[PDB]
């Protein structure tokens, strides 16, 4: 596509049935600087959903 | 500040014509929560129209 030149190799090409799986990156991405701690250990809490 | 949480229209920039809400207006640089995609953008307060009693009024509301 960049040059319009043919590819030296031919490409296996055609329809195939593909699935959209439940795993999406913006449901997983997570970062923590500081945030909440456990009352008993004062160590950071567990889980994306709790910071 | 008197324009937080009030509905806004953008009149300049790449987001021109889009609806939003003033999420945070600390000073000069506001944070408008766009309606159309799920993102809150930085925008100068000069770029906004606020809704009031009669139509969309610039930052004289």
């Amino acid at each position: 596509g960049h040059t319009g030149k043919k590819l030296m190799a031919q490409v296996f090409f055609g329809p195939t049935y593909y699935q959209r799986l439940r795993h999406m990156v913006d449901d997983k991405i997570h970062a923590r600087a500081r945030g909440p701690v456990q009352v008993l250990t004062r160590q950071p809490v567990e889980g994306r959903s709790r910071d | 500040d008197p324009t937080l949480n009030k509905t806004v229209k953008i009149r300049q920039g790449g987001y021109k014509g889009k609806i939003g809400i003033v999420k945070e207006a600390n000073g000069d640089r506001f944070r408008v929560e766009l309606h159309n995609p799920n993102k809150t953008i930085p925008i100068p307060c000069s770029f906004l129209l606020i809704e009031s009693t009669h139509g969309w009024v610039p930052y004289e509301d």
Binding site: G1, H2, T3 | G14, K39
Partner: protein
């Protein structure tokens, strides 16, 4: 969530130049041109045109990362010619070839009506 605005591919920020020329002093008479908000479309077009000039000794370009709409070109000309000038000529040369091409299409189009 971290997706940039699609208009950033072609709208130039006001503090960002469409074009920036610096020298490559490692060899004589060579410039590096950084093009902002441009594609293979412009770069490959200029590149071939330039490479066929007899007084162009080196021309290449690369898009360093497909997620950012810029590219960088390297252009060296022989002692006689000044590199930036050869680039100006390639622009006007290609504009002319496209003017001709637009004319011949217009004519051929009426002929096919």
């Amino acid at each position: 969530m971290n997706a940039p605005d699609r208009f950033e591919l072609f709208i130039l920020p006001d503090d960002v130049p469409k074009l920036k020329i610096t020298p490559d002093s490692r060899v004589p008479n060579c410039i590096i041109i950084k093009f902002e908000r441009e594609d293979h479309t412009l770069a490959n077009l200029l590149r071939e045109e330039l490479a066929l000039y007899p007084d162009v000794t080196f021309v290449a370009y690369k898009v360093e990362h497909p997620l950012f709409a810029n590219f960088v070109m390297r252009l060296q000309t022989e002692e006689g010619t000044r590199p930036k000038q050869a680039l100006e000529r390639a622009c006007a040369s290609i504009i002319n070839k496209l003017k001709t091409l637009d004319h011949k299409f217009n004519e051929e189009w009426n002929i096919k009506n």
